[PDB]
Design a protein around this ligand. Sequence first.
Ligand SMILES: Nc1ncnc2c1ncn2[C@@H]1O[C@H](COP(=O)(O)OP(=O)(O)O)[C@@H](O)[C@H]1O
Ligand SMILES: Nc1ncnc2c1ncn2[C@@H]1O[C@H](COP(=O)(O)OP(=O)(O)O)[C@@H](O)[C@H]1O
Ligand SMILES: Nc1ncnc2c1ncn2[C@@H]1O[C@H](COP(=O)(O)OP(=O)(O)O)[C@@H](O)[C@H]1O
Ligand SMILES: [Mg+2]
Ligand SMILES: [Mg+2]
Ligand SMILES: [Mg+2]
Lengths: 503, 502, 502
Amino acid sequence: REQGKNAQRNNIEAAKAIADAVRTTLGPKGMDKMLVDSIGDIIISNDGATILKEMDVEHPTAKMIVEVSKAQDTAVGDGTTTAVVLSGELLKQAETLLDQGVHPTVISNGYRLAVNEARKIIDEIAEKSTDDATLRKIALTALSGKNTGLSNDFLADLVVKAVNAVAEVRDGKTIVDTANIKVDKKNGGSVNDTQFISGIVIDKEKVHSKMPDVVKNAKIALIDSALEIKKTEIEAKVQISDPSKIQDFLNQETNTFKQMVEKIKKSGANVVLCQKGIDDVAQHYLAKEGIYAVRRVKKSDMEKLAKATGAKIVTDLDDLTPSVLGEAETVEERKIGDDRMTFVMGCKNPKAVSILIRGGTDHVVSEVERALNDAIRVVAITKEDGKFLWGGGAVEAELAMRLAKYANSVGGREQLAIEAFAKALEIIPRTLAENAGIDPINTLIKLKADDEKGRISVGVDLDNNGVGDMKAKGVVDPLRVKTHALESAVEVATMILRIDDVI
Amino acid sequence: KDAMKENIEAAIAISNSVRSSLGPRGMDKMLVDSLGDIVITNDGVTILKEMDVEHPAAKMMVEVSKTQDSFVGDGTTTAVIIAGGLLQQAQGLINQNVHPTVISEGYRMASEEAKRVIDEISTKIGADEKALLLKMAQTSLNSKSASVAKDKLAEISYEAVKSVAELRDGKYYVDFDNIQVVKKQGGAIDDTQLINGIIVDKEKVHPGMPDVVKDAKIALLDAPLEIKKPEFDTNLRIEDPSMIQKFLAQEENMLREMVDKIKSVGANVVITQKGIDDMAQHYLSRAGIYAVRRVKKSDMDKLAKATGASIVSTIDEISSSDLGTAERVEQVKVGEDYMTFVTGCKNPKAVSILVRGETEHVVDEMERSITDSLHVVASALEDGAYAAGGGATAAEIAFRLRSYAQKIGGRQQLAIEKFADAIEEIPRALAENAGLDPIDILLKLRAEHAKGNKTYGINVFTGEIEDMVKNGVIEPIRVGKQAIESATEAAIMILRIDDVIA
Amino acid sequence: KDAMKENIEAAIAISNSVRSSLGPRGMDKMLVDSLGDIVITNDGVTILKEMDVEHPAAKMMVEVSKTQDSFVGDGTTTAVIIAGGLLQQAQGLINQNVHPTVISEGYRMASEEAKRVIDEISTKIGADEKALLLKMAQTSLNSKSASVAKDKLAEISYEAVKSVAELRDGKYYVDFDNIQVVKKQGGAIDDTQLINGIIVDKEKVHPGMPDVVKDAKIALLDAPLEIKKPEFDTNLRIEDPSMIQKFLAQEENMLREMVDKIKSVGANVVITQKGIDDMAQHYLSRAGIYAVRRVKKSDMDKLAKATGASIVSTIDEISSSDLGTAERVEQVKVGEDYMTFVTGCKNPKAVSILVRGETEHVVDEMERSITDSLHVVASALEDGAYAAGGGATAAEIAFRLRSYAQKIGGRQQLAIEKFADAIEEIPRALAENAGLDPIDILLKLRAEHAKGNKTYGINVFTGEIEDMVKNGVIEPIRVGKQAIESATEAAIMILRIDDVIA
Ligand SMILES: Nc1ncnc2c1ncn2[C@@H]1O[C@H](COP(=O)(O)OP(=O)(O)O)[C@@H](O)[C@H]1O
Ligand SMILES: Nc1ncnc2c1ncn2[C@@H]1O[C@H](COP(=O)(O)OP(=O)(O)O)[C@@H](O)[C@H]1O
Ligand SMILES: Nc1ncnc2c1ncn2[C@@H]1O[C@H](COP(=O)(O)OP(=O)(O)O)[C@@H](O)[C@H]1O
Ligand SMILES: [Mg+2]
Ligand SMILES: [Mg+2]
Ligand SMILES: [Mg+2]
C-alpha cells in the first residue's frame, strides 16, 4: 500500500514508463519492437495495441494506460500509440503542478476545460473533403512507420477501393461497414500480389478431389449442421437377432447420406458450404452429384458469405428450399501459394469484398496485415466523416498555441492546468522529430512560430529535416482518431490523478 | 484495557483509509486484489467492501459501510468517518476512567438527539422539486470523478427516477427494478444517455433472426428450449433399421413443436434465461422470431415489469396472457458490441441508463457514480425533505448537542459533548481534503452556527463559510440520520467488547 | 506525522511506567539489570535512570527525570507525569492541524503563567517553621515505604537540615556536604538515628590502634604513606655485602620518619584516601595513632569541613595548621561492622544520619527515601514558601490557565487549555492510584477551586476533597515550578522534532 505523494508520483512514474515503451514507434521513421513469449514465440510489430496487449505489464497503473490502446484500437483503429504517449505526458506534466501545490482535482478540471476546448478548436479547424484523392492520402499516412515495403501507394489504392466498394448510403449519409471487407493473408512472397477480390475468399479447399474445380452461376447453400450420422438424444441401442439385419443396418447409414445429398441436390444448390464436418460417404455422393462442398467453414465466414451471396444459414436440411440459396457468378477453388482456397465471386450482394494479403516470410505478412487494417479503418471513418486534420505535429502545434491563449482567459489554478495540457500536446511533434533523429527543441521552436504566423498546416517535415507544409506532403490525420485519442487520454489521466492511495 | 486500545486503533485505521475521499476535493483509491483485479474508485462502500481487513474490529467498521450503503445509498464514507470520531473520542474519555457503559448511553442519547435535530433543521422539498432534486443529484456527482459531467448525469439521474416514481398517497415511491443501468465502454462520459425501455447486453442467438421487430409480443422463458429427456432411466430399442429415422424425426418434431407453441400464442420475441438448442434456433429463426438466450435473471425481471410479461418455465403452457409487450425490439450496435433494445414498453415507468466511458475501469466508476445519484434523487424524493450540506448540518448538530449535554448533565454529558466533537469530523475532513485550515474553518463554522446560521457550511472552492442551501449543496435528510445511526451503533459495539479471543 | 506519532507514544510510555508510583497509594518498581542487580524502589528518578530505554524520545523523557532531580530533589515522578500529559494532549491538538509551533508557544506561555500562579497561591513559612517543615518532611515520606516511620524519619530530616542551615541575610542556606548519610543493614527502620559528627564506614587499619581517642588532632592525607621511589630510573648498586642492611634500614627509616612528621605536628588520627604501608602501619600503631585508610574522597571532604582540617597531599609539609579537630574519634560496631565515628567536630554544623534497615535492599530504599526528605525540608527552608499539595495547587493552576486561555485567545488558547488539562494529570494519578474515581474527584476538585478554594486537594485516605494545608499535605514551592518547567521543555523539544534519523 502507498499513500499520497508516494502513490501519486509512483503512479505517474509507472504510466510514464509504459508510455515510453511505445514512444519510438511513432510516425514514419518509427521502429519496431520484438515481443517473445514461451511457445508461439516471436512477434515483431510497430502497432501500439499489439506491443502492449502482448507486453507483460504488471503495475496496475500501467495496466490502465494499456487499456486505452486496446480501446483506441477497437473503437477507432488508428492512434493507439498516440493515446498512450499522450496519457503519459498529461500525467507527467501534472506532476509539476502537483509539486507546486495545485490539487489533483483542479488539475483534472483544467484538463477537462482544455480538452473540451480543444474538442472545439479542432472541429473548427477541421478540413472537410471526401474525394478519393484525399481518402488515398489518409491511407498513405496510416501505413507510415510500418514495414510494408515500397508498395504503400499500391496498398493505399486497394484500401480506398475496398472502402468505396462497400460504402453504402442511407438517409443521406455514407456508411462503411468494415465488416464487409474481408482481409486475409498467405505467405507467398510478393506484397504486390495482394489481390483485391470482388467477392469473398475462404481459406478452405473443396472436401473431395472429384468435385468441380470451378462452379459458374452457383446456387450456394450455407449449412449449420454436419453432414454426418446423427444419434438420437435419448440413448439408443440396436439389437440384432438375425444375421441378415447386420447388413440392413449398415445400409441405413449409406442411404442416410444418400438422402442428405438428395435434399441438397433437390434445392438446386450446386455448392455446399458447411460450417461443420462432412462424412466421407456424404462426400462420395456430393461428388457424384457434382456439388462443390467445403467443410468446417468458420462461423465468421458463414456469416459474411450469407450476407454477400444473400443465402440463409440453414440447419435442418428439410428447410433447404431454393428460397434460401445464395448467388455467385463463380465459385472456384484456386491455389494461392502453397494453399488451395475457395473463391466466391459475383456474389448477389456487391457490398462485400476481400484483400488477400501476400508477402513472404510470415512475420512480414502479419504486420502488413496490421498496417492495412489501420488504413482500412481510417479510410472508412474519413469516408463517413468527410473531415480530416493536418498531420505530423500540425494539429497539435495549433491546439497547443490556441490552448495556451485560452489558458490566460481562465482562472489562476486552472490556467496553470491548461497551460500544462498545452505543453503535453507538443509531445507529439517533439516525438516525431526525436525519432526522425532531428532536434526536438528547435523543431518545436520553429514549428510554433510558423503555426503562430497562421500556418496551420506546418508539421514536422522529416524530409525538409525540420518543419514543413503538411498540406503539400499530404499528411492528414483523420478527425475521429484525434478526438478519441484526446478524450481517452483525459479520462484515464484524470482517473490516475485522483488515486492518492493504492492498496 | 489493551484489547480495547487495540480495537479502537484498528477501527480508526479503517476510518482514515477512507477519510481522504470525502467531498469535492476527495481523492480516489486503487484496489488490487490477489487475482490482480483492479478497482479504482471513490465510493467508500466499495473501498471498504474491497480492502483486505483482518482485525475483527476493522471488519466491524466495514460492517458499517455496507449497512449505510444498504439503507440509504449515499453517505458510507460519512458513516465511517463518524464511527472513527466517536471511537477516537471515547478513547479520550476511557483514559479518564469513564465507564464504557456511560459512554455508550451518552452516545446513544446524543445520537437520538442528533436525528431529532436533522428533522428540525430539515426542509420540505417545495414546488422547486426539479431544481432542488437537480442540486442534490449534482452534489453527489461532485465528489465522484463524474463531476466532469455532473450537469448531464444529474439531469439523467433526475429524469430517470422522476419517471419510475409512483406518487401514491400524495407520497412518492421509487422501484429501482424499473431503472435498468448498463455500462458500455468506447464512448466519452458525456455520451451517457437515457433510453426509454430496457436495454439488454445480448445480441440475437442466430445470424438469421431480424434486426428489428415492431409491435413485439415478448415471450419470456425461464426454461431452455431443448428436447425433454424423461426422469426415469429411458432407452430406445431399435430392432428394425427403419426405426432409426423415425426416432430422429420425432426428436426434431418435439423441438419444432416447442417453437410452434411459442409462435402459435403470437410470440414475436423469445427472451430466455436458459439455452436455446441449435436446431430450435433454426426454427425460431425461420419463423422470423427474434430470440436471445442465456439472459441475466436480474434482466429477466426488468423485462417482465417493463413489458408486463410473465416468466414462463413451462413452455407447454405458455399462454397469450403470458406475453409481454413493447413497441419495438431491435439489435443496435453500442460501439463495439450489439445490444438488444426493447423500446416502447407496455409499462412506461421503466427506463434505462447507458453509461459510456472510454475505458473499462473508467466506465465502471461512471456506473457507480450514477447509481449514487439515482439513490440520492430517489431517497430525497421519497423522504420529502433535505438538509444543507457542506458540514453545515454537522456543525449544527454539533452545536445543539453541546447544549443538550448541559441539560442531560453528568458523566453522560462528557460522552454527549465528545459525540458533538466527533460529528465535527465531517467539516474537518471536508476542509482538510481541500486544503482549508481545519481549525480556522471549524472555529468560524462554530461562530455562524452559534449565531443561528443553521445552513453555513464549507464552500470547499472559495474556502468561505457560506449558505449551503443557497449555493445549492444539499442532501436528502435520510443520508444524515443513518450515518449517525450506523456510526453510533458501531462505536457502542466496539465500546462494550473488553476482550477479543479465538 | 508518523515520526511524531511514534515519538509521542514512546514518550507517553515512559510516563506511564512511573505514574502508578505517585502519591501515598503509590506503588513501587522492581528493576533487574543485565548483571542481575536488583533495585526495588519508588523514587521515579531511579526508576527512570534505571530502566533500559532505547527509543530516543523515551531517553528524552528520562532526561526530564534527572534534571528535576538535579535542581530540586523531590518531584521527578511529577515532572514525568506532566510531560506525558502535555504530549498526549498535543497529540489531540496535532490531529486538528494545529501547528507544533503554535502548540509550543501556547505551552510556553501557559508554563510561564503556571509558575506565576504558584508564586501567587504560595505561602511564606511563618513562625511555624518547625511543624510546617515537619509536615513537609512527612508528606515526602508518605509516598515512600518509609511511611512506616515517617514520624521519626521526618524529625531526623528536620533536625539534620536545621543544624547545617546557615541563616545569612535573614535567608537560609543548606550545604549538604555537612550532612553525612550512611546506611547499615541489620537494624529496624525505627533504628535510624542522627549522629552529631561524621561517621565513616571504615575501621582502624591495624589491630593495635586504640578504639578511642579523645580530643583528636585529625591529620587528613590525600597521599599514601609509603617509600617514595624517584621519578628517574633509579637502581641500587651493592658491591659490599655490608651495604645491604644499610639500605634496608634507610628504607624503613623513611617510613618511620613520615610517621614521625605526622606525629610531631601533634596529629592524633591519620585518615588517608590512599594506602598505608604495612610497616608504616606498625609505626602509627606503635605511636598510638588511630589511622584509617583507603577512605572515600567524598568522605574526605566531609571530614574536612567538619573538623576544619586540610587534605594534605605532601606529608613532608604537613603543618599543625593542617590538623582537623574533634572531641573524640572512636571505632564502634554498627551491627556487624565496625565504623569510625568522629564526634564533637570543630564545626558543629556537620551531622550524620545512620539509616538502619533489616535487609540490604530495604536499607537502600530507606536511604533514598530520607535523602528525599532532606532535600525537601532544605529546599522549603531556603525558598521560604510552600504550596498546598494533594493536587490542590495543580487543580488551581489548571483553573487559572483556563482563564488566561480566554485572555490570550486564539489557537494559542487551545494549547493553553490543553496545558491545563495536562496539569490535571496529577489529581487524576493521585486519585487513580488510591482507588478514587478520577472523573468524579476531578469534577468536585474543579468545583471547589472554581469557588476559590485554592487549597482543596485529594485526601487519598478519606477520598474527600479537603483543605490540604490544614490536613498538612504541603510541599516546597520549588518542587512545583521545576516540574512544570522541565515538563514543558520536554514537550516542546519532542514537539518540534518532525523526523528522527540515524
Ligand atoms: N508522412 C508523415 N509525415 C509526418 N508525420 C506523419 C507522417 N505519417 C504519420 N505521421 C504522424 O505520426 C503520428 C502517428 O504515428 P503512428 O505510427 O501511425 O501512430 P498511431 O498509432 O498513433 O497512429 C501522427 O501525428 C501522424 O500524422
Ligand atoms: N459543493 C460542495 N461544497 C462543499 N461541500 C460539499 C459539496 N458537495 C458535497 N459536499 C460535501 O461532501 C460530502 C460528500 O462527500 P462524499 O465523498 O460523496 O461522501 P459520502 O460517501 O458520505 O457521500 C458531504 O458532506 C457533502 O455535503
Ligand atoms: N497525604 C497526602 N494526601 C494526598 N496527597 C498526597 C499526600 N502526600 C503526598 N501527596 C501527593 O502525592 C504526590 C507525591 O507523590 P510522590 O510519589 O512522592 O511523587 P514525586 O516523585 O513527584 O514527589 C504529590 O503531588 C503530593 O502532594
Ligand atoms: Mg497509424
Ligand atoms: Mg456522495
Ligand atoms: Mg515525593
